[PDB]
Scaffold this active site. Structure first.
Site, mmCIF file in Angstrom:
data_model
loop_
_atom_site.group_PDB
_atom_site.id
_atom_site.type_symbol
_atom_site.label_atom_id
_atom_site.label_comp_id
_atom_site.label_asym_id
_atom_site.label_seq_id
_atom_site.Cartn_x
_atom_site.Cartn_y
_atom_site.Cartn_z
ATOM 1 N N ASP A 219 68.522 48.664 -63.029
ATOM 2 C CA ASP A 219 69.774 47.928 -62.871
ATOM 3 C C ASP A 219 69.826 46.713 -63.792
ATOM 4 O O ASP A 219 70.758 46.561 -64.590
ATOM 5 C CB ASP A 219 69.954 47.513 -61.410
ATOM 6 C CG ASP A 219 69.946 48.698 -60.465
ATOM 7 O OD1 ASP A 219 70.037 49.844 -60.952
ATOM 8 O OD2 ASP A 219 69.853 48.485 -59.238
ATOM 9 N N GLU B 57 73.925 51.080 -54.565
ATOM 10 C CA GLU B 57 73.385 49.958 -53.808
ATOM 11 C C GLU B 57 74.390 49.419 -52.796
ATOM 12 O O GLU B 57 73.992 48.882 -51.757
ATOM 13 C CB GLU B 57 72.943 48.854 -54.775
ATOM 14 C CG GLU B 57 72.601 47.516 -54.136
ATOM 15 C CD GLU B 57 72.084 46.508 -55.147
ATOM 16 O OE1 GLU B 57 70.999 46.743 -55.720
ATOM 17 O OE2 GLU B 57 72.764 45.485 -55.374
#
Ligand code: NAD
Ligand code: NAD
Lengths: 268, 266
Positions: free
Chosen positions: A52, A165
């Site tokens: 990420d 997420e």
């Protein structure tokens, strides 16, 4: 409409993307924000070595490189911060991402002195901090560091939150979830890998026959990223995996909203 | 077409006149209804500084927990108050008088200065000087960390002190004292906050008080003008410009982190 269709619309996930186009969508979105806010000159992000923060960091750096070439203003820079907990923490993964991002500024701030001092001040009041809570304390202390650097360089704090997420609320409230702008928001886990592949990232930065082994995030969640991504792409997952995903969703509604006021109704 | 003043009042939910007794109930019932819906939440956590906002929010949370215990018989429903001083020189007298009126179930004291100074030292270690204003925001975020640490250990929710007069000007630290779970004071201006404190029988040294107040000096506008603005009255062209300028500047504090789908900033 179903809960799955609603969640997909809320997070704006497409069942299929153009990774080259999505990179431009991410970069132009960032650049558009700078132009509308001339008081913002830099971008700040903690580089942990993970997928990420590597992708969000590269997109942030590519945005600033285009900004200073289009505008000639050399104030536009991206600042990468390594945020290890301790002085013997392995940083090989972090600087592997750094070599790919090539940031204008590369800083390293150890968060262990502050975290250990805060833990000690808490123990001084009878509050013993568990192992997992201490993890949340580290993410919030990393939030403070990035915001301290932005507060000096007229910067905005990049956030690494994405679709996979966000369904699970797999982030610390006002920790890594505390940020200014979200270049990755709309992409699921494997879509993020596709963008990293599109940007020429070495394959060792998103990956690491028989079934693929589990990562730490999947052990905590009880559901794999493939099922989470299949769910967000509108595909049919098992009844068990669907229950796991939607349970995380309802469990973390309070993280997906501002602080709750007397006018809110999502929680009722 | 509707004025910006009308939009802001509708957005923040301010009423030109209120009933302090009823508004006390509306906050208490709101906190209890949220706990009832979420049986995993057992405590309220709030930093007590002595000022008007945290005192009114602390008393409301403490009262709600008292009713929660009497209605359910579950003695784990407690309110946790934490004094969060920076060092020892910081005067405790005003925060102490707030605790005397609130009478909390649990009263803690956590000094944030060791953590804050360690953060500054590690940052200056990397070549990052920290100004006094940037250090001010760091204190509010360290206080946020303390409160969520206590809440993370005690199955608790962090009480927030944000209200209408604070939301217009965005006069709070992003993810500092603005980082909270539930806002019992949201909809009230500054003077309405004083009115509820009077309804709750707080001593006049906690909310009464030409001298200069630090908030209005930095804001370039008085709280009476902000409260007149939020009550729908007409204010001077100078004061209206000052307020609406703060509202546009702090829009990023009133929204979740910017995604590609947002348009309020465009
Ligand atoms: N077993 C694990 O692997 C494990 C354990 C703990 C945390 N984590 C990770 O830490 C991050 C966050 O975990 P977390 O949730 O335990 O910490 P968190 O601080 O992010 O969220 C919990 C806090 O949010 C508040 N809160 C809780 N429920 C609320 C509700 N209904 N309404 C309003 N506020 C509420 C409370 O103040 C609580 O302290 C995630 O990424 C998670 O994966 C993992
Ligand atoms: N002279 C004074 O009295 C004085 C001075 C400064 C701060 N303060 C107090 O600190 C509080 C916080 O105010 P602050 O702004 O200084 O700190 P802040 O952290 O709340 O806001 C600044 C941060 O927010 C981000 N940001 C700024 N503009 C943004 C934008 N357009 N879009 C997205 N993100 C953006 C940036 O990450 C920046 O670092 C103030 O409300 C005040 O209570 C007082």
């Amino acid at each position: 409409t179903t809960l799955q269709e609603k969640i997909i619309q809320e997070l704006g996930v497409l069942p299929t993307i153009d990774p080259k186009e999505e990179v431009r969508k991410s970069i132009d979105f960032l650049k558009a924000y700078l132009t509308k806010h001339p008081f913002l000159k830099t971008f700040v992000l903690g580089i942990s070595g993970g997928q990420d923060s590597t992708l969000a960091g590269r997109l942030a750096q590519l945005a600033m490189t285009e900004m200073r070439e289009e505008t000639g203003d050399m104030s536009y820079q991206f600042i990468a911060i390594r945020l290890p907990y301790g002085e013997q923490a392995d940083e090989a993964d972090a600087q592997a991402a750094l070599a790919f991002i090539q940031p204008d500024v590369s800083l390293r701030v150890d968060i262990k002195p502050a975290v250990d001092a805060m833990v000690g001040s808490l123990e001084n009041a009878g509050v013993q901090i568990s192992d997992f809570n201490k993890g949340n304390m580290k993410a919030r202390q990393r939030m403070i560091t990035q915001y301290a650097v932005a507060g000096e360089n007229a910067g905005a704090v990049i956030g690494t939150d994405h679709a996979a997420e966000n369904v699970t609320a797999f982030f610390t409230k006002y920790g890594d979830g505390g940020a200014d702008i979200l270049p990755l928001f709309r992409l699921n886990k494997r879509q993020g890998k596709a963008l990293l592949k599109e940007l020429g990232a070495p394959e060792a930065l998103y990956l690491k026959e028989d079934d693929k082994p589990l990562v730490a995030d999947e052990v905590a969640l009880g559901v794999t990223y493939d099922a989470i991504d299949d769910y967000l792409e509108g595909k049919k997952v098992s009844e068990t995996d669907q229950q796991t995903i939607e349970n995380w969703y309802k469990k973390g509604q309070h993280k997906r909203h501002l602080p709750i006021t007397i006018f809110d109704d999502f929680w009722k």
